[PDB]
DNA sequence: AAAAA
RNA sequence: GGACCUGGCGGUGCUUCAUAUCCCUCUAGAGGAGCCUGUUCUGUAAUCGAUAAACCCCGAUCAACCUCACCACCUCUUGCUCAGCCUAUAUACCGCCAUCUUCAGCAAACCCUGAUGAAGGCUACAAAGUAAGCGCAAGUACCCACGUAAAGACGUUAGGUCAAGGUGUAGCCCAUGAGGUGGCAAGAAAUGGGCUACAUUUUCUACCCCAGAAACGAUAGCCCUUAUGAAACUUAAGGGUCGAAGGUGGAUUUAG
């Protein structure tokens, strides 16, 4: 049972990008070249444009795993900057202590 | 993967293991709203009927 | 997403909001409020809507020198326990709606003429069982302070007496 | 295996049994709730893959097959369903993992299923004979098993030892008044198996010896010969045969020690070393040895059991709860009868706290022997154990503890004795009274406390039970020592009004106390 | 329901061995240990928190299982598994002249059921190129082929080998690279005249 | 045991990061958080393979629940098989 | 109350017995310091507060000094001045007043017949289970001063000395650097120095010319500005010794001025080897034999530079 | 770090040296340059194995064989 | 007012314990940490999974014991040996406690691939320190 | 705005 | 109608101070100008909230086609995990915070005086005050005992937020719900903050000041190219002729 649709769409985009990634990587490798015949680049662009969206890594948004917040999320623990601060002030995770200098 | 965790929580709630007071309060509020006069709308009641 | 389950006491405090500003300033009415009924009382450990007998959580374990099996209840027993829970919650609601017979004194909502009972005994070991306290005057006193605004103070005049000529009064 | 906090500390034996059973039930219900939903244990995170993360499944994976599906439903409403499916889908019956399982699990239905599986198609003869013997041994039948074994031996094949063991069991144990005939039949079967070139295992010999010892009581030479033949086969023999031989030898030899010595020698020759594993209950021999040592006061059998059940391995020492309690009681009795006081106390402290508690008769004998040697220190623990064991033994234990302190008064250094007497009186009063009440009153009068003695006298005089003459004399002396015969007069009046034997004597004592004081 | 049982306070004598009580890493249970340890934040007129319900003592990793007599017994019991270090390898000079090849290992630790680590698959081959057949032309060619990875002061070669997810395969690849390097000393081409 | 090792105290490191105290228009108040950690390395010398394995086993059998451990053991070897006159 | 104290004492002594048994030493020689060491080794509490440390001392330190009972079963108190709140304080006041009048009588009779410090209120209230204020304490101190100024003798002398203490050391003079000889090293001496994140180790000699070497090379190539040159010349100028002292310092870390000040401090602390103590005292009172902990202030998350705020306006 | 991580027991000659995967490719031109580039890329990839490189080579071969006219008109002869 | 997780000082009637009674800035001074693992140091990763497992274990322990616990629970992640050392109240039968402990240990060992052993503490009720 | 043999 | 008590206030009197505060006073900034980012206005179909000392590179430590809560077109009435809202109340909350806070006062148990009225209980050469507890001092860490950081109660602002996250009350699921393609940061105009310089204090060249020279620098816009991105309508950078008010600011202010 889920309550939010934004996190569901984000994780679905992540899964579809994880599934469809080798083809996009090969197309991007075939694109950026020095010389190379132009027909190969043209057909690579056609193949990468014929595929629909909902699979591009650009469409992936890093959000929290409990609150789904798009801004203010540390990549170390991957969550919002409120629940982590509260759990740190409660005295649970070691090391994360208030800066007393 | 929150799906398996939610399914396990619902299974423990139906069997009577994970005594979650939040779901109990939600069910209490739903029962109170139903007995007051605002039940959950069903198919065929609202705009058409 | 689904891990937003907090603690029960915090949920009850948020649903009731006892520290409301509308009750400490005289701006709102005391009748307009929400009542509370507890749910953690008549729920034994390991009780659901399917039925599973536990050899250690309910029935005795050592039954005639043998271990009992772990089966599943049918439908009639489930209906019976549901009816029992319904009767229990109905009895709870009935007990929570019955009001005690308030012994009136001189009139209706007036503390004058109400017997409080025997006074508190002294710490030395002296107990006053013959004397009886009586409420005479009750009034709410307000005073504009500096921070609390209208500080409410209750001033009650209670008299004492036993019935042998020796009596007194105090405010 | 339990816990360490005092609220969950294994004190007595019933608490340990209940905790172990609760742990087993919890493990069973956990396995049930895990295997109930296979869709919740399909994600493996650990790369090395722990083998304890694969749930077990009970449903077949291929329903189009017949024999394979039946085998998966039976072994890897079970056997009957598999047989019905094989009969409906026309599946052939094999000789492995089929007839033996039907004869063991599913004794009329199992025998019928084995006969049907044997007569369905022409499978193996030795396996069919073994299945028939296993089905007939559990239904009191030996002629059919013997005929099947003879047919399998004469059909140019080598019969297994399981069929011969089942036949010997059904012929010896499932009979009445037979000892020499069973031994002769076993010898003939062994000779036939040796002549027909068949390897005989020690399990069949052990089963034959157990069945021969479980019948007659004077069967000593045959049991010894069977034990020697089982030991002269390869490794150590099974412990069930040795336990049966010891039980058969100790049941007849109760006046002399020759039978006990022969049984001990047979047990040492069959399996007298480390934790030998070839039987179904190796602790039975240790339990029988402990019972024999506790009933006959043997100093060598208990020592041999302690040396063979604790030095090598801690497996053949205590298997069941009653066996462990009997072994602990026998060890306590041996320590009380052989060692002095300090060594006996050390053994009791290192044995009762490590394992379970004692039994009953041996525990009472050890308590009496400890109390007869002036040792009243663990009276509260003994009273608690007697109260937790039963509602009738606690009063007897309290009476036995107060009988050694009621007649003794307070001397120069009698603080521990007075404390033990007070504890015994409290345990006797908190049992739910005549003899116990009289003993408590005598202890309170001999202790020295006047208020406690007066309370005990008032409780005994109002319980519709008068005491003995010694308590009345002590009360009269205590009343006359303070120049006040009112207590003696009241005691005499209570004894005369309750219809007791203290009438003329009580009146004379009251008159003497009033005249002298 | 309710019961009362004496803990280990009345059971411990005077000469009881400590590792025999807690042989495993025990988290210090105050209900069984009769040690009156007290810590916390006291007040002006009162006493600090004792041992009952003391969560701070449970948080602190106690080392009661590291009894000195237990350490002595463990050290005396593991003397059979220890081999013998020869006296010829005590000095650094002979140890380096007889064994110049060095292969560093990588063994990290994790906090979960998985022990995988992509950083624990790299070997550091530190071979001192001073105990081989290094002449003049061969040494110059090796230096010009390496560049800056070979230090000209301590003469220690440093090659980061981590192109396969195994350690023995990394060692074999490093040995093959050293073989190809040493092949240049015995197999020339035709571009040495224009040096 | 008879190994005779050395031990010194390398400099420590403190990881610091600043987080917002609230969530709204309160930029003047920030609650920073640090991450104090220490380092104590052991300088061991003269240990064979079996001795090092036994020492690592005895260390791991008494490992806490909040420390790290990286093992960098260098083995000794004269020369391999193909290094003098190899083929391809 | 006493039963709980006895329980705590017996628990403490059985714990001490168990600790001495598990450690492997004799319980009689198992002093309290060894107890604390064993507790710190077995219970490593890694905190910053000194009160949250696992201790196991006598219950006299854990429990505060409980006030004893001054009345019995009859009801009469044991002290004379008990019906007045404070008993010991007023008794001591009466005693010191009696001593004062005795001293006055003795002085009158003599005329007719012709390092340490006082107590603290905190220490006083910790020694005597009694609470007081400040004005009464000042009055008691003034009475003690009047007692001391009078003609004392022996009895009153020891009576007023029992209410005294002892101050700590007051000579904050630094240790004189001895003369070290390292392989034909006459007039050789070293020193250190740490200020404004700069470490210097000067090597002062008394047999060369008048130059300064910084990390091998001279100071001209390393200190192009005359500021550092004057800062390094100031110590040699304060002693009137320039062309007869040569130094060779190896400074590292910090800027030009920080390293210059570090070398200056090192030279000042190293020159205390071939001169009297009066000269080093004159150098210390002028600003040489002293540390400079002027470190950069910690910036605050909300201020411009650890002092000035951001852009706070009025409207 | 070797328990359950042997990488199918493949040796280093198949991971590093990819010379045994150059058969249906020319020796001169941009095709051989691209092959050398992808060989240098796969040879310095410690995250993949021999199977991934074989799959990549097979996919490249299939992509080259599918578009044959492009390779013919790309001013080169696909050998 | 920076209202944090500290207990508010109002009327003397809340039986506050000793854990969350202190201020949130006295953690590294007059308190401690409930959880402890290698993920909280420099150079280590996979801390999100550890935090998720910790919060899930806390929720499970709070749900399976509706009132049987006192304060919180101390976590000790010793590589692959989790220990949920906590306390227990003296209000229910020991059979139920043993059953719950065994069920929790089996669930942990069969789900999180880690054996767990408990160390219960005998306390009458909540470790109260102040009646404020 | 009273207390699961 | 008259009288008494407390708080706020008095452009109400006296007394001790303003260690960065008010001038006589020292330095650096905001409306001299440009670029970037916000409030608000206008047009369009194109979120919203705070918008008064305590809001203006604020929610957002990321808005080129999900993030996007808006609009135009096409579908689904289990309407996706038998469950919610992308709609209104923070005058229903839990939770996270703000100027006061650059200090020290407030709450349980007693007694006395106000004839036992609301209230007050300060005089150490002492006339009735004892006070558990809270916050600072006392305490932790860094460069110790200096200094800094972390903290600093009971509340006014129905203060900011149902818009970290969840819960009460209204309306709906044959929608005010959900999925697909594109557009939304465009300009009559007012306003705050950050950076840049407004020449011999500046600019350049190698050594960061024993040097030399030319009587100055960052930004529109334009062309090419580069790291990621399926495709630069902008925030990134490098190259190139042109290169916009600039020549030290007067009505009011802030910190050290
Ligand atoms: Mg603040
Ligand atoms: Mg919506
Ligand atoms: Mg609002
Ligand atoms: Mg303070
Ligand atoms: Mg603060
Ligand atoms: Mg608002």
From Swiss-Prot, chain B:
Residues 42-49 have a biased composition (Basic and acidic residues). Residues 29-49 are annotated as: Disordered. Residues 31-41 have a biased composition (Basic residues). It is found in: Mitochondrion. It comes from the Eukaryota. Component of the mitochondrial small ribosomal subunit (mt-SSU). Mature mammalian 55S mitochondrial ribosomes consist of a small (28S) and a large (39S) subunit. The 28S small subunit contains a 12S ribosomal RNA (12S mt-rRNA) and 30 different proteins. The 39S large subunit contains a 16S rRNA (16S mt-rRNA), a copy of mitochondrial valine transfer RNA (mt-tRNA(Val)), which plays an integral structural role, and 52 different proteins. Belongs to the mitochondrion-specific ribosomal protein mS33 family. This is Small ribosomal subunit protein mS33. It comes from Homo sapiens (Human). The lineage of its organism: Eukaryota, Metazoa, Chordata, Craniata, Vertebrata. The gene is MRPS33. The chain holds residues 54 to 102 of 106 of the full protein.
Swiss-Prot record, chain C:
It is found in: Mitochondrion. Disulfide bonds: none annotated. Coiled coil: none annotated. It comes from the Eukaryota. Residues 131-171 form the S5 DRBM domain. Belongs to the universal ribosomal protein uS5 family. Component of the mitochondrial small ribosomal subunit (mt-SSU). Mature mammalian 55S mitochondrial ribosomes consist of a small (28S) and a large (39S) subunit. The 28S small subunit contains a 12S ribosomal RNA (12S mt-rRNA) and 30 different proteins. The 39S large subunit contains a 16S rRNA (16S mt-rRNA), a copy of mitochondrial valine transfer RNA (mt-tRNA(Val)), which plays an integral structural role, and 52 different proteins. This is Small ribosomal subunit protein uS5m. It comes from Homo sapiens.
UniProtKB/Swiss-Prot annotation, chain D:
It comes from the Eukaryota. Abundant in testes, skeletal muscle and heart tissue. GO terms for molecular function: ribosomal small subunit binding; RNA binding; rRNA binding. It is found in: Mitochondrion. PPR repeats lie at residues 125-159, 160-200, 201-237, 238-279, 282-316, 324-358, 359-393, 433-467. GO terms for biological process: mitochondrial translation; regulation of translation. Its main location: mitochondrion. Disulfide bonds: none annotated. GO terms for cellular component: cytosol; mitochondrial inner membrane; mitochondrial matrix; mitochondrial small ribosomal subunit; mitochondrion; nucleoplasm; plasma membrane. Component of the mitochondrial small ribosomal subunit (mt-SSU). Mature mammalian 55S mitochondrial ribosomes consist of a small (28S) and a large (39S) subunit. The 28S small subunit contains a 12S ribosomal RNA (12S mt-rRNA) and 30 different proteins. The 39S large subunit contains a 16S rRNA (16S mt-rRNA), a copy of mitochondrial valine transfer RNA (mt-tRNA(Val)), which plays an integral structural role, and 52 different proteins. Associated with the 12S mitochondrial rRNA (12S mt-rRNA). Mitochondrial RNA-binding protein that has a role in mitochondrial translation. This is Small ribosomal subunit protein mS39. It comes from Homo sapiens (Human). The gene is PTCD3.
Curated annotation (Swiss-Prot), chain G:
Residues 293-315 are annotated as: Disordered. GO terms for molecular function: RNA binding; structural constituent of ribosome. GO terms for biological process: mitochondrial translation. The keyword Transferase does not apply. The keyword Cytoplasm does not apply. Its main location: mitochondrion. Keywords: Acetylation, Mitochondrion, Ribonucleoprotein, Ribosomal protein, Transit peptide. It is found in: Mitochondrion. GO terms for cellular component: mitochondrial inner membrane; mitochondrial small ribosomal subunit; mitochondrion; nucleolus. Component of the mitochondrial small ribosomal subunit (mt-SSU). Mature mammalian 55S mitochondrial ribosomes consist of a small (28S) and a large (39S) subunit. The 28S small subunit contains a 12S ribosomal RNA (12S mt-rRNA) and 30 different proteins. The 39S large subunit contains a 16S rRNA (16S mt-rRNA), a copy of mitochondrial valine transfer RNA (mt-tRNA(Val)), which plays an integral structural role, and 52 different proteins. This is Small ribosomal subunit protein uS9m. It comes from Homo sapiens (Human). The gene is MRPS9. The chain holds residues 70 to 396 of 396 of the full protein.
């Amino acid at each position: 049972h889920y309550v939010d649709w934004r996190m569901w769409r984000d994780v679905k985009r992540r899964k579809m990008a994880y599934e469809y990634a080798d083809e996009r990587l090969r197309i991007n490798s075939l694109r950026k070249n020095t010389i190379l015949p132009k027909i190969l680049q043209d057909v690579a662009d056609e193949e990468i444009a014929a595929l629909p969206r909902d699979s591009c890594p650009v469409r992936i948004r890093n959000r929290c795993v409990m609150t789904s917040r798009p801004r203010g999320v540390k990549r170390r623990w991957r969550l919002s900057r409120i629940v982590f601060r509260h759990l740190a002030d409660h005295g649970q995770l070691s090391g994360i202590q208030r800066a007393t200098w | 993967n929150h799906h398996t965790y939610a399914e396990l929580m619902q299974t423990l709630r139906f069997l009577g293991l994970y005594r979650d007071e939040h779901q109990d309060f939600m069910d209490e509020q739903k029962r109170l709203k139903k007995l007051r006069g605002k039940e959950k709308p069903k198919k065929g009641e609202g705009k058409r009927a | 997403s689904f891990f937003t389950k907090l603690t029960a006491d915090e949920l009850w405090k948020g649903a009731l909001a006892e520290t409301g500003a509308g009750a400490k300033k005289g701006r709102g009415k005391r009748t307009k409020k929400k009542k509370r009924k507890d749910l953690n009382r008549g729920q034994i450990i390991g009780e659901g809507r399917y039925g599973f007998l536990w050899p250690g959580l309910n029935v005795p374990l050592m039954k005639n020198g043998a271990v009992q099996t772990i089966a599943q209840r049918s439908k009639e027993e489930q209906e019976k326990v549901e009816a029992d829970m319904i009767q229990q919650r109905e009895e709870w609601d009935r007990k929570k709606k019955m009001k005690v017979k308030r012994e009136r004194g001189w009139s209706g909502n007036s503390w004058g003429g109400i017997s409080l009972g025997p006074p508190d005994p002294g710490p030395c070991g002296e107990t006053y069982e013959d004397f009886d306290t009586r409420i005479l005057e009750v009034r709410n006193v307000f005073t504009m302070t500096a921070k609390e605004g209208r500080k409410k103070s209750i001033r009650v005049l209670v008299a004492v007496g036993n019935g042998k000529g020796a009596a007194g009064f105090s405010i | 295996v339990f816990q360490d906090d005092p609220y969950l500390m294994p004190a007595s034996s019933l608490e340990s049994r209940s905790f172990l059973l609760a742990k087993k039930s919890g493990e069973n219900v956990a396995k049930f709730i895990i295997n109930s939903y296979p869709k919740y244990f399909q994600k493996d995170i650990a790369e090395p893959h722990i083998p304890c993360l694969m749930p077990e499944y009970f449903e077949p994976q291929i329903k189009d097959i017949s024999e394979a599906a039946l085998k998966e439903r039976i072994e890897l409403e079970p056997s009957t369903d598999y047989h019905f499916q094989q009969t409906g889908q026309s599946e052939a019956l094999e000789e492995e993992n089929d007839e033996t399982s039907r004869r063991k699990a599913g004794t009329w239905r199992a025998k019928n299923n084995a006969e049907r599986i044997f007569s369905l198609m022409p499978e193996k003869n030795e396996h069919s004979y073994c299945t028939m013997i296993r089905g007939m041994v559990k239904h009191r039948a030996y002629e059919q098993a013997l005929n099947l074994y003879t047919e399998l031996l004469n059909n140019r094949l080598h019969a297994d030892v399981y069929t011969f063991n089942a036949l010997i069991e059904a012929t010896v144990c499932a009979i009445n008044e037979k000892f020499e005939e069973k031994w002769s039949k076993i010898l003939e079967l062994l000779r036939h198996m040796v002549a027909q070139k068949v390897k005989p295992n020690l399990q069949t010999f052990n089963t034959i010896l157990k069945c021969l010892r479980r019948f007659h009581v004077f069967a000593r030479s045959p049991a010894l010969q069977v034990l020697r033949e089982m030991k002269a086969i390869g490794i150590e023999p099974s412990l069930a045969t040795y336990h049966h031989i010891i039980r058969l030898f100790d049941q007849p030899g109760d006046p002399l020690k020759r039978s006990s010595f022969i049984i001990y020698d047979i047990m040492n020759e069959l399996m007298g070393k480390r934790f030998s594993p070839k039987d179904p209950d190796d602790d039975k021999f240790f339990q029988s040895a402990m019972s024999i040592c506790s009933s006959l006061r043997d100093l060598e059998l208990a020592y041999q059991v302690h040396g063979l059940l604790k030095t090598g391995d801690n497996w053949k020492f205590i298997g069941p709860d009653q066996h462990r309690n009997f072994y602990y009681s026998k060890f306590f009795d041996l320590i009380c009868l052989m060692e002095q006081i300090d060594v006996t106390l050390k053994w009791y402290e290192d044995l009762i706290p490590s394992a379970y508690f004692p039994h009953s008769q041996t525990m009472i004998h050890l308590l009496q022997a400890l109390d007869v040697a002036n040792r009243l220190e663990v009276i509260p623990k003994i009273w608690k154990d007697s109260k937790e064991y039963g509602h009738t033994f606690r009063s007897d234990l309290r009476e036995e503890i107060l009988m050694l302190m009621a007649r003794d008064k307070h001397p120069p250094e009698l603080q521990v004795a007075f404390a033990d007497c007070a504890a015994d009186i409290k345990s006797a009063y908190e049992s739910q009274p005549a003899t116990s009440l009289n003993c408590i009153a005598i202890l309170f009068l001999r202790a020295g406390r006047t208020q406690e003695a007066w309370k005990m006298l008032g409780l005994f005089r109002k319980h519709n039970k008068i005491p003995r003459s010694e308590l009345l004399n002590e009360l009269m002396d205590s009343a006359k020592v303070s120049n006040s015969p009112s207590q003696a007069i009241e005691v005499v009046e209570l004894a005369s009004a309750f219809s007791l034997p203290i009438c003329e004597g009580l009146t004379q004592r009251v008159m003497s106390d009033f005249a002298i004081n | 329901r309710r019961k009362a049982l004496p803990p280990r306070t009345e059971k411990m004598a005077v000469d009881q061995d400590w590792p025999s009580v807690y042989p495993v890493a025990a988290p210090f249970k105050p209900s069984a240990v009769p040690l009156p340890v007290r810590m916390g934040y006291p007040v002006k007129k009162g006493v600090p928190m004792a041992k009952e319900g003391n969560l701070e003592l449970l948080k602190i990793p106690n080392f009661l299982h590291l009894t000195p007599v237990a350490i002595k017994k463990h050290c005396e019991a593991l003397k059979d598994f220890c081999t013998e270090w020869p006296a010829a390898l005590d000095s650094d000079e002979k140890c380096e002249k007889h064994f110049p090849i060095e292969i560093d290992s990588t063994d990290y630790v994790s906090s979960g059921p998985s022990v995988r680590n992509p950083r624990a698959r790299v070997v550091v081959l530190r071979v001192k190129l001073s105990s081989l057949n290094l002449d003049d032309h061969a040494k110059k060619k090796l230096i010009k082929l390496v560049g800056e990875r070979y230090c000209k002061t301590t003469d220690v070669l440093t090659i980061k080998t981590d192109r396969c997810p195994l350690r023995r395969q990394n060692y074999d690849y490093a040995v093959y690279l050293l073989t190809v390097l040493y092949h240049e000393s015995w197999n020339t081409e035709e571009w040495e005249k224009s040096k | 045991l008879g190994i005779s090792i050395k031990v010194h105290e390398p400099p420590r490191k403190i990881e610091r990061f600043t987080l917002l105290q609230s969530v709204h228009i309160y930029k003047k108040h920030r609650v920073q958080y640090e991450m104090r950690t220490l380092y104590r390395c052991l300088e061991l010398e003269h240990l064979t393979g079996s001795t090092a394995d036994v020492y690592l086993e005895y260390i791991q059998r008494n490992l806490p629940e909040g420390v790290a451990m990286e093992v960098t053991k260098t083995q000794l070897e004269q020369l391999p098989e193909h290094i003098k006159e190899p083929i391809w | 109350t006493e039963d709980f104290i006895k329980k705590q004492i017996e628990e403490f002594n059985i714990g001490k017995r168990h600790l001495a048994n598990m450690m492997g030493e004799d319980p009689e020689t198992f002093t309290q310091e060894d107890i604390d060491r064993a507790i710190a080794y077995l219970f490593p509490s890694g905190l910053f507060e000194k009160r949250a440390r696992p201790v196991m001392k006598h219950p006299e330190q854990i429990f505060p000094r409980q006030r004893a009972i001054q009345w019995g079963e009859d009801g009469r108190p044991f002290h004379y001045l008990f019906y007045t709140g404070k008993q010991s304080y007023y008794s001591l006041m009466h005693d010191v007043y009696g001593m004062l009048l005795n001293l006055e009588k003795h002085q009158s009779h003599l005329q007719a017949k012709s390092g340490s410090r006082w107590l603290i209120k905190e220490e006083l209230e910790e020694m005597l289970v009694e609470k007081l204020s400040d004005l009464d304490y000042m009055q008691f101190i003034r009475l003690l001063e009047k007692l001391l100024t009078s003609q004392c003798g022996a009895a009153e002398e020891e009576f007023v000395q029992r209410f005294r203490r002892s101050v700590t050391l007051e000579s904050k003079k630094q240790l004189i650097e001895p003369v070290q000889y390292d392989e034909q090293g006459m007039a050789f001496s070293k020193s250190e120095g740490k200020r404004k994140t700069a470490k210097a180790e000067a090597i002062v000699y008394k047999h060369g010319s008048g130059r300064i070497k910084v990390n091998g090379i001279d100071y001209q190539l390393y200190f192009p500005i005359t500021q550092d040159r004057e800062q390094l010349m100031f110590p040699f100028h304060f002693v009137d010794r320039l062309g007869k002292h040569d130094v060779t310092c190896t400074v590292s870390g910090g800027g030009r001025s920080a390293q210059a000040g570090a070398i200056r401090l090192a030279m000042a602390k190293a020159l205390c080897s071939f001169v009297t103590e009066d000269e080093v005292e004159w150098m210390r009172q002028a600003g040489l034999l002293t540390t400079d902990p002027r470190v950069r202030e910690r910036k605050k998350p909300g201020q411009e530079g650890a002092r000035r705020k951001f852009t706070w306006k009025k409207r | 770090n070797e328990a359950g991580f042997d990488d199918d027991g493949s040796e280093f000659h198949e991971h590093i040296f990819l010379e045994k995967h150059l058969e249906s490719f020319p020796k001169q031109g941009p095709i051989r340059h691209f092959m050398e580039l992808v060989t240098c890329g796969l040879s310095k990839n410690p995250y993949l194995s021999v199977k991934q490189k074989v799959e990549h080579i097979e996919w490249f071969r299939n992509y080259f064989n599918e578009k044959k006219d492009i390779l013919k008109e790309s001013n080169i002869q696909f050998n | 007012k920076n209202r944090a997780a500290r207990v508010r000082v109002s009327k003397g009637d809340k039986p506050v314990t000793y854990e969350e009674a202190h201020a949130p800035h006295y953690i590294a001074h007059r308190k401690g940490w409930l959880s402890l693992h290698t993920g909280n140091l420099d150079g280590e990763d996979h801390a999100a999974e550890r935090t998720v497992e910790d919060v899930f274990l806390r929720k499970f322990m709070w749900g399976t014991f509706p009132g049987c616990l006192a304060d919180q629970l101390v976590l000790k992640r010793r590589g692959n040996q989790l220990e949920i050392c906590a306390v227990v109240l003296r209000q229910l039968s020991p059979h139920k406690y043993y059953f719950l402990v065994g069920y929790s240990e089996t669930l942990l060992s069969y789900f999180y691939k880690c054996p767990v052993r408990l160390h219960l503490q005998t306390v009458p009720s909540k470790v109260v320190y102040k009646y404020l």
